[PDB]
């Protein structure tokens, strides 16, 4: 009944010191409200600092705010709507859509922060997802119930792989995907918007499934931090209700951690549980344990851990890397070199990969495929030294099987249309697995250099040489 | 004599580069020590600065 | 770090390059640009598509020539091509 | 509770180092003055008390047995570290 | 009426006077507290409110009884100015340290004063010839500019400044000045001696040099404001006199160090590398003030002692920007034994361009830098494997580069204390030609040890002949 | 016990490193700030409390002994350096020597000192 409101007294840094009235002290993490001439000002309470004054670092611009403006609590934590109504929309951290796409009324707008699954609600399984890219179709399965990480600096564009994975999975997904744009560059935001809308994934008028929510990177840090909280809440709702294997992609968990540290420093708290961050433990663990597997179903996550250019020192990056199960490494150097997938089947990994978990043949070929590429990596140094002669008949076969297979590792993307110009490829697991084996098996060992590279499946590597051989004759 | 000399220079490619490989190992150990110490000290100084601010 | 996480990329003009006489000193390997040739006049693109790979190869042979010794035909050709470029 | 019954057992304080870091955060928030490695010096006190808990009892009290399995995190072999 | 204030608290060198009246002393103004040993002037630094302003000491802080009556001058510390300054080595307060009594100054401008006007900045490309080889080719010295010699702790900064002083001053063609901050006491004594002996300051005749000494001994506030006093004297000698004035600042990093020591006791939260919270802003206000406007020419030598011998230190990093022609000297080059110690691969002068000192000079410097960079780049494989394991082209370049590096040093006129040779001033054009030849192999067979501590390539050949006579 | 019986008592100490580290722990607990590396405002006075008051009197002596197991046999800990400086000659108690024929195995090989004057 009674609308609890207080007097926002002090604005320091990007934080507004929201005092309150007797019994009106809002709880920490509760959704406040601040109506401003520019619109709605979003402030999330912080450490309730006594003196009936609960601190708050706002989710909107600190500008224009006038001391003593009344702020009335929303009665609970920060909220964004939950449900299929969110599909096709760009949900902001405050929750006001920034696309001017009108309010897609949903069943509920749940509070962002909540409980995680109990150990009686946390299950585990060994499942592989059809990622459509032969790199992730062979060298590292993606988990239908387990985290799937990634790496690669600027220019490796792992977000492109993310969109491609979303599209391919949705193309055969019984449940709706999800994303979370943790502080992406705005232009990359619009380009992601265009590519997601036109790919058919974001059906502007239809029934889309990949609800992209972006933190927008251009706000005070609190919104950026809580954005992933919002996205996890949304995916939790989707798994809880639709009960289908609901994907989960996080834009830049490294940017999420930068935002968390920026929040901690922005808050009065002393950041020291990492050496530069005290909250890193709690927040990172909460976000990761939000991705949970239940007896009802699994909500598979896919977080992108940007590599701060070989930041082996950072404790938080090591916590993230040893916070998951399977990953793919997409380097821009010596991995994007002549590769549209831009991945490194060597440095990749898949804990779910067992002959009894990934297919008996798939492990047999991958073992050779990993070894041959490692041998190709092993023969990478020798061939350039004295020439391509030193290899034995089996070795030169490997050099002629792998250097084409490593070239064949590439694949144009169904979403990378705007740049490369090659129409995309989306073979399956039963396709890619036997595809690489036949490449290993030499049944098409006569194919040209670029014949299986930047191609589709094995049956699709036949035409590439055949149509290109027309120019020679 | 030519066979012995080719064998001996191949040795010089396994007994002079071997010394160079030893030099590289020693330099790499020293540099790895310096970099591991520098990273740790940087993190420690960061923690000290952050607390001394607080 | 924050700028390199927010900016479009970088032309990380390392001091060694500018000291190596290459003025201007865009250390091509250490350079980066998220936008890329899609934001470029294709007249540049037809030659840059090879220029980038040639610089990449030169990066692959920089160590080999640093050893200062002989190699195969591909390696020596790559070194000459990269230095010339 | 197991050991004084005279039986044997094995405790595993898995990754005690992270527990020490948690203590460091607890001290910092509780405003206990920071010290070396910024964890409160009380980290050693808590760790010693938690570590000297287990041993093999004598025949005087029935001879209970208990094995500890603590783990740590060698931050680059953090030999000069405090917690390690 | 008189303005009197009571010293409310004296903590370290940052003292507090609670001037309990209406018109409190203005910020950046001078408050005088009459200690029995002198006039401990103070810089009213922060009006901490409640009629309390925190001051930085301009002298000793011991024995100031809490509540001493502090009289306010009101305006900035009025540094005496004028030609009379010449030959007198003033103190940080402007008080004449020379035991020649008060100096009859026609006027006294404020020590703190407005920087040069953004529209009064006479851009110039004139290169001032100092003669030192690294100064000769690798980085030209801008005539009427601000050349900063950011370098390690005494690894050449003091000697390079002294030699440059003994070189430029004789033909200064104007009225130069010397300003020190944190100067070694013996080094300050030596600088005064050399200026007296060179005839730069004539004790009973005309003097082209007026000194302000801020040796490290002083209290931190004095160390910080001494260079500001020097800059005020310099700007006065630049506009009012309107003639070229060479003002050299020694260890301007000491000014930033004074800022750092004062700031913490002044209640500013610790900054980067514990440096003062206002490093760049203050350094600019005391550096951008020094420039050669159309009013007059200013030759500025602002040596910066890069703390921790690693130019990554935040104070030296902020220093690097405001200075024009940077001649870095680092301990790495010194350990090789070269006295001039200039890091040729690093020390650069933006005053040097194609059309500045000559297309041939620009190409000579470019080739020399490329060769030395090649030597540094190949040093790793050289140490790991050996000179034989690499290319004969690479070996030839390495040998030429080693000879060139050994040619980088030179005998400086006042450094004859160390190397023992009478100093040699290499002519700019002669030096450029010598280097072009040496890269071109016109003396590539001369001896390496006969390339160090000589003049031009002529003296190099003479040394090679002498080594042919002696070494054999 | 030495002064209450005039009895010259040799003292054995657990570990100077142990006591100094415990004193560092307590000094941190007090409220002092961390120092450059791993110290605090009152590092030295801790061990300086006891060891500076154990000397030789007329009633006997107080020549204590500090038990040290050279941690990784590295002298990059200041307390171990000052302790090894405290000792006069070194007894190389190599494990092999214990089996070599000496039950005590106190090697006088490392008995180096310049105090042997005429």
Task: Tell me about this structure.
The structure is cut from a larger assembly and holds three copies of chain A, one copy of chain B (54 residues) and two copies of chain C. Chain A has 473 residues and is an alpha+beta fold. Chain A is 33% helix and 11% strand. In chain A, the strands form five sheets. In chain A, strands 5-6-2-1-7 form a five-stranded antiparallel β-sheet. Chain B is built from two helices and no strands. In chain B, 6% of the residues are buried. With 54 residues, chain B is an all-alpha fold. Chain B has helices at 2-15, 17-53. Chain C is mostly helical and 85 residues long. Chain C is 56% helix and 5% strand. Chain C contains four helices and two strands, in the order αβαβαα. A two-stranded antiparallel ribbon of chain C has the order 1-2. In chain C, α3 (42-67) crosses α4 (73-84). Chain C is globular, with a radius of gyration of 15 Å. The N and C termini of chain C lie far apart (31 Å). Chains in contact: A-B, A-C, A-D, B-D, B-E, C-E, D-F. Chain A binds chain C through residues 153-155, 157, 185, 188, 217, 254-255, 258, 306, 308, 332-333, 337-338, 384-388, 418-419, and chain C through 1-2, 4-6, 8-10, 29, 32-34, 36, 38, 53, 56, 60, 64, 71-75.
